[PDB]
């Protein structure tokens, strides 16, 4: 049941990117929206992950916006 988990996680990820105020950088927001739309309209599992990676590396690319060190520490 892992296909319909990537679709929702992309919605959460784009919500996080929007809350980080990435709407300002229009070149970045166009790519994030395109990745989100192509994740949701994806009927194949591997392509969904290969686009989820590109979407996530937008979130990781912001040094002083999120705190990945604390967030992953709860594992």
């Amino acid at each position: 049941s892992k296909m319909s988990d990537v679709k929702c996680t992309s919605v959460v990820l784009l919500s996080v990117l929007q809350q980080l105020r990435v709407e300002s950088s229009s070149k970045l927001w166009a790519q994030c929206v395109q990745l989100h739309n192509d994740i949701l309209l994806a009927k194949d599992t591997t392509e969904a992950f290969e686009k989820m990676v590109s979407l996530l590396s937008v979130l990781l690319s912001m040094q002083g916006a999120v705190d990945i060190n604390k967030l992953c520490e709860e594992m």
């Binding site: 892992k2 988990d5 990537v6 929702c8 996680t9 959460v12 990820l13 919500s15 996080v16 809350q19 790519q31 992950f49 290969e50 686009k51 989820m52 990676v53 590109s54 996530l56 590396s57 937008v58 990781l60 690319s61 040094q63 999120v66 990945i68 060190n69 967030l71 992953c72 594992m75």
Partner: protein, 142 residues
């Protein structure tokens, strides 16, 4: 019965003051704690997916090895990732191969913080302290 009807009216008013207060307090708590609950939910789901590339980029991003642009997917496309420590360099760079996002990339250009190009020969454990270390590796997808 007049007394009991008045008391019942007061009890119903107390219930209407219970529910409205509850679903105002919960509403303001949910709407005032959205910037962090969303992120914690996202990383809970990211642990739940249990993929390879997602774990690879997250585990590298804990150790300061973030990418400076969106990871491309097309063959022979460019990616500039910072490597901030020699320990974060020993794990990903093997020869001219660069393991990232569960894919192999070819290293093109390694530039230190002073932006001057440094070849792969100069990256040695003895010579590691002698560089302004937060390297940017510009690589291409293989």
């Amino acid at each position: 019965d007049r007394d009991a009807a008045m008391q019942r009216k007061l009890e119903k008013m107390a219930d209407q003051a219970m529910t409205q207060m509850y679903k105002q307090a919960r509403s303001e708590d949910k709407r005032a704690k959205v910037t962090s609950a969303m992120q914690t939910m996202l990383f809970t789901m990211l642990r739940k997916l249990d993929n390879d590339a997602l774990n690879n980029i997250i585990n590298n991003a804990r150790d300061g090895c973030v990418p400076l642009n969106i990871i491309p997917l097309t063959t022979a496309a460019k990616l500039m990732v910072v490597i901030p420590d020699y320990n974060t360099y020993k794990n990903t760079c093997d020869g001219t191969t660069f393991t990232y996002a569960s894919a192999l990339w070819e290293i093109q250009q390694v530039v230190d913080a002073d932006s001057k190009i440094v070849q792969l020969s100069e990256i040695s454990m003895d010579n590691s302290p002698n560089l302004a270390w937060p390297l940017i590796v510009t690589a291409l997808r293989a």
